[PDB]
Write a protein that binds this ligand. Sequence first.
Ligand code: HEM
Ligand code: 2QC
Ligand code: CL
Ligand code: CL
Ligand code: CL
Length: 411
Amino acid sequence: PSPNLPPGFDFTDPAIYAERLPVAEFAELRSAAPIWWNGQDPGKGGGFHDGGFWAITKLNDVKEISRHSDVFSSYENGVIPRFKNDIAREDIEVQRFVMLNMDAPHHTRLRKIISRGFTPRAVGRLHDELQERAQKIAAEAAAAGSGDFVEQVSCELPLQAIAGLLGVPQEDRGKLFHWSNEMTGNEDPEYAHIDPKASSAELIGYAMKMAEEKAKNPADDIVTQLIQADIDGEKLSDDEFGFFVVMLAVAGNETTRNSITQGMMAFAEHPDQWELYKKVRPETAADEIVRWATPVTAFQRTALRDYELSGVQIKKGQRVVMFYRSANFDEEVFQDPFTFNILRNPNPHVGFGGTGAHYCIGANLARMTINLIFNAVADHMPDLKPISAPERLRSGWLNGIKHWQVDYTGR
Ligand code: HEM
Ligand SMILES: NCc1ccc(-c2csnn2)cc1
Ligand SMILES: [Cl-]
Ligand SMILES: [Cl-]
Ligand SMILES: [Cl-]
């Protein structure tokens, strides 16, 4: 029995996400076709011209794909499953220069370097400054009375986390934030004029100058650990540091922003969870917010060989698309997946991906950012109330909120 979906439905269609999350449609796949061939008409594959892909909807299959990175490649077609239909193949392949789109052994070496400086100690060293910034953000928003929660609450702390991790001078954070924002959303009419390639090139140029500067003056950041040779002489070259900065700018900005916006949307819809949060301030809330928000709807892989997955024969060369938005509501893993429960524990969501080689290196920085901003929201605008419905982002793989009008003082 085929799944009850409209003919030609494409779960990476940006026109869907501009209006809604296809929650009923994912639930139908989980019940009737948990691994399902998503066909794509000629020229309508978002930059891929292979006839379609396997939709992966169950959490255990997402973990299996993610852990078998020897078979399911990030490099072969990159991990973003949807671009503009007319994107040039060369513009997909240039994305192989960021760690996200690399396979072992190249990925292994680069991740080892990135992780010697990107440690729990390094992240914890940002706690106090990000806490001060979160309190300032929430106080200034509340002072405004009403406004766009996305812009006045959600946007700034994730960017300041990237700046503090890298030790970016305060005078440069404006342009750093500009470049980061220019590298996502280009399929939405509101952002039709951004140029992510041009922005990435400007950020690489900036980052390579940073690498040369911070080599002369080591400072209390991660850059020095990254650009300094270890025992084996392993280190990021200046251009590798540049591609890492591009990586961070695109990985840790709008993802965390959208988790914050949709976290507060969830609190607005579940007042009892908001009351509980304000009283207990449970840090388990961050993981339930990421599960609920699933800011990356999906990443893909490409089979390097034939592989049988939960009884379905994946063929060499075929793409599999891991729908984290479906897996995070998998009835076989979660008790009451469609209950927003900030005390959920353990919370084995895959909002940060399936376990394995590419697991989000910023997961704990993201959780800390979320916990700090929601404490600040609780401290300064405990009675906020939405004014109008969120405006969603036209994207085929990112779950974004562009704007959300709220009354911070609660009438
Ligand atoms: C709630 C916010 C975030 C979400 C939902 C998220 C999600 C993800 C996902 C789904 C992946 C791919 C994992 C996989 O394929 O197995 C990933 C990888 C990555 N994330 Fe995050 N992320 C978030 C925040 C951040 C932040 C704040 C940073 C750094 C400041 C960051 C840096 C990275 C990097 C560098 C990678 C690539 C790791 C690799 O390929 O080895 N992310 N993230
Ligand atoms: N942290 C998850 C994440 C990683 C890379 C991207 C991204 C956006 S454009 N190229 N890569 C977005 C989100
Ligand atoms: Cl293709
Ligand atoms: Cl088109
Ligand atoms: Cl659960």
